[PDB]
Design a protein around this ligand. Structure first.
Ligand SMILES: [Mg+2]
Ligand SMILES: [Mg+2]
Ligand SMILES: [Mg+2]
Ligand SMILES: [Mg+2]
Ligand SMILES: [Mg+2]
Ligand SMILES: [Mg+2]
Ligand SMILES: [Mg+2]
Ligand SMILES: [Mg+2]
Ligand SMILES: [Mg+2]
Ligand SMILES: [Mg+2]
Ligand SMILES: [Mg+2]
Ligand SMILES: [Mg+2]
Ligand SMILES: [Mg+2]
Ligand SMILES: [Mg+2]
Ligand SMILES: [Mg+2]
Ligand SMILES: [Mg+2]
Ligand SMILES: [Mg+2]
Ligand SMILES: [Mg+2]
Ligand SMILES: [Mg+2]
Ligand SMILES: [Mg+2]
Ligand SMILES: [Mg+2]
Ligand SMILES: [Mg+2]
Ligand SMILES: [Mg+2]
Ligand SMILES: [Mg+2]
Ligand SMILES: [Zn+2]
Lengths: 123, 53, 44, 112, 92
RNA sequence: GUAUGAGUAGCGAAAGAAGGGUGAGAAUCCCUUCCACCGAAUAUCUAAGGUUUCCUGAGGAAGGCUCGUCCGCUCAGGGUU
RNA sequence: CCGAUAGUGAACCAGUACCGUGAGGGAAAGGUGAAAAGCACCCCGGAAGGGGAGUGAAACAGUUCCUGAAACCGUGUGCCUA
């Protein structure tokens, strides 16, 4: 099945959407072990939408990605959003690799509460 | 719901036989040659599987 | 709910103040016996 | 010739019972391995015990001129210190006692 | 009081000296001195022409120095501004 | 004064996440973005009451039901026309 | 006659701190050393705290500091124990 992360079905839905957007924007983040074993599935299912390139696939992924600016370019300074980067930058990278677009590296316990922290990175 | 008799020293020491904590599963690093946890990124030389991370 | 002590600056001086003790024969006896103990504060 | 060195941390805020559980791991081990054990044990007493062990090694070579590579943790024990007495307001007007305990930590290193 | 008894000492701080160029001078005066007495005390000592005086009362701060508790003195602070066609006071 | 119960009960209504910064040390301090809660109030004034708790610069022994580089806590200067 | 649970409630900033709306109730708390000579300097540590060196008759007299019992908490070991 799937694991509940100490929060109700509404907090859990929001938590997975913030963490999946951060991995797209930053490509390398600090989380806990259980919290990273879960976004390992919602992110790779999101690259697969980016590898389609459809309008149907883009509209389906737009219901999950948060609306935030990755960075601003002067093409005319126009911002670039996370959905644009997923479909134009991140997805074309893995046009040949079938699966496993992420990897997890263990770091060690956290001082405050002893939680096990890991690196999840987008390669 | 209330202790009938106070606990002696021997009985209080027997119960704490199992309240110890185990030894960490540490290992010698291949690159920098010092201690680290298995299946973990080395905190000193910052390497795992022979590649810097 | 609500408690027994409801502070008020005026209500305290009008009942326990110095000029209230000095106005009665038995109020001057309270000050006399508090001076006997050598208490730091007389009246309120 | 002394052949041993010691360091003491007096009136450390940690409670004696919570520090004795970490001392029991490093007793009788080599100082090279004993430092790693305290580094990879996720308890609050590990940083405190690790500075006492490192200080004992420090004056085991500056004061008595011994080898860092031959030292072992010969002795390690935790004593008690003066406790701080506090209170916690409980229900229905009653108060309960709280003991903020301290401890003394002693580590002795020597040759093998 | 006398002129020298009403006025005690100037106040030299960051706020006090930031208004010297505005022809405003801050003093510590007697606790029982009215606003009008401060006006004529200044003109007797410094021979300036006084336009306004503003006064305020300060309480005493509760201070501790080890097992001992007490209060500092209560202050009365006066700010004197002078007419533009008059001399100045040199705090220096 | 110190034990046993015992490393046991509890830690006092609630949504947080990531990236930078400071630092000996960061889930807990600062900044940014996203998300969430109140909105005849959990918004704005003002009496009573409390008396310096207000501001700035340093601090981390004790207090803060954890942590603390932080604070309505400690020290020194100020502030009410 | 007492000698710091004694002797005044108070040998110490005591009718104080604290408690109560108020009248009122009301504590705990003495001892470094003959002399501060109260640890220059070095090492670990952010600090606290330690290990040397030094003062001292004594530092196992180092800022609740003469003496330091019992409960209570530990480390090592000779004999016994599933
Ligand atoms: Mg809902
Ligand atoms: Mg009345
Ligand atoms: Mg009174
Ligand atoms: Mg109550
Ligand atoms: Mg006025
Ligand atoms: Mg039980
Ligand atoms: Mg249970
Ligand atoms: Mg809470
Ligand atoms: Mg008022
Ligand atoms: Mg403030
Ligand atoms: Mg704390
Ligand atoms: Mg600092
Ligand atoms: Mg601060
Ligand atoms: Mg303050
Ligand atoms: Mg007595
Ligand atoms: Mg005696
Ligand atoms: Mg009172
Ligand atoms: Mg020393
Ligand atoms: Mg020192
Ligand atoms: Mg010595
Ligand atoms: Mg000598
Ligand atoms: Mg003597
Ligand atoms: Mg003694
Ligand atoms: Mg004894
Ligand atoms: Zn390594």
């Amino acid at each position: 099945g799937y694991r509940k992360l100490g929060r109700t079905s509404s907090q859990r839905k929001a938590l997975l959407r913030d963490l999946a957007t951060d991995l797209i924007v930053h490509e390398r983040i600090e989380t806990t072990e259980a919290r990273a074993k879960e976004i390992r599935k919602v992110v790779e299912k999101l690259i697969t939408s980016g590898k389609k390139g459809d309008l149907h696939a883009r509209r389906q992924a737009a219901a999950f990605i948060r609306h935030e600016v990755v960075e601003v370019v002067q093409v005319k300074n126009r911002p670039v959003y996370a959905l644009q980067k997923l479909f134009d930058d991140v997805a074309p990278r893995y046009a040949e690799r079938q699966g496993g677009y992420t990897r997890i590296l263990k770091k060690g316990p956290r001082r405050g509460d002893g939680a096990p922290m890991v690196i999840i990175e987008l390669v | 719901a209330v202790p009938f008799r106070r606990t002696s020293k021997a009985k209080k020491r027997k119960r704490r036989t199992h309240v110890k904590l185990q030894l960490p599963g540490m290992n010698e690093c291949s690159n920098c040659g010092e201690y680290r946890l298995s299946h973990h990124v080395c905190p000193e030389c910052g390497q795992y599987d022979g590649k810097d991370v | 709910m609500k408690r027994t002590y409801q502070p008020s600056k005026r209500k305290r001086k009008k009942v326990h103040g110095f000029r209230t003790r000095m106005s009665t024969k038995n109020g001057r006896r309270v000050l006399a016996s508090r001076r006997r103990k050598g208490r730091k504060v007389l009246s309120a | 010739e002394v052949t041993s060195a010691k360091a003491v941390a007096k009136t450390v805020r940690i409670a004696p019972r919570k520090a004795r559980i970490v001392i029991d791991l490093i007793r009788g081990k080599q100082v090279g391995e004993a430092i790693a054990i305290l580094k990879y044990t996720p308890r609050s007493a590990s940083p405190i015990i690790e500075k006492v062990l490192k200080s004992a090694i420090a004056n085991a070579e500056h004061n008595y001129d011994l080898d860092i590579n031959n030292l072992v943790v010969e002795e390690a024990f935790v004593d008690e210190g003066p406790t701080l007495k506090r209170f916690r307001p409980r229900a229905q007007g009653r108060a309960s006692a709280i003991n903020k305990r301290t401890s003394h930590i002693t580590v002795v290193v020597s040759e093998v | 009081m006398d002129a020298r008894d009403i006025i005690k000492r100037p106040v030299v701080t960051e706020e006090s000296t930031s208004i010297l160029d505005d022809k405003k001078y801050t003093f510590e005066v007697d606790t029982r001195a009215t606003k009008t007495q401060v006006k004529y005390a200044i003109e007797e000592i410094f021979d300036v022409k006084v336009a306004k005086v503003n006064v305020m009362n300060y309480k005493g701060k509760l201070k501790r120095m080890g097992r001992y508790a007490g209060y500092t003195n209560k202050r009365r602070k006066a700010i004197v501004t002078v007419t533009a066609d008059s001399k100045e006071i040199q705090f220096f």
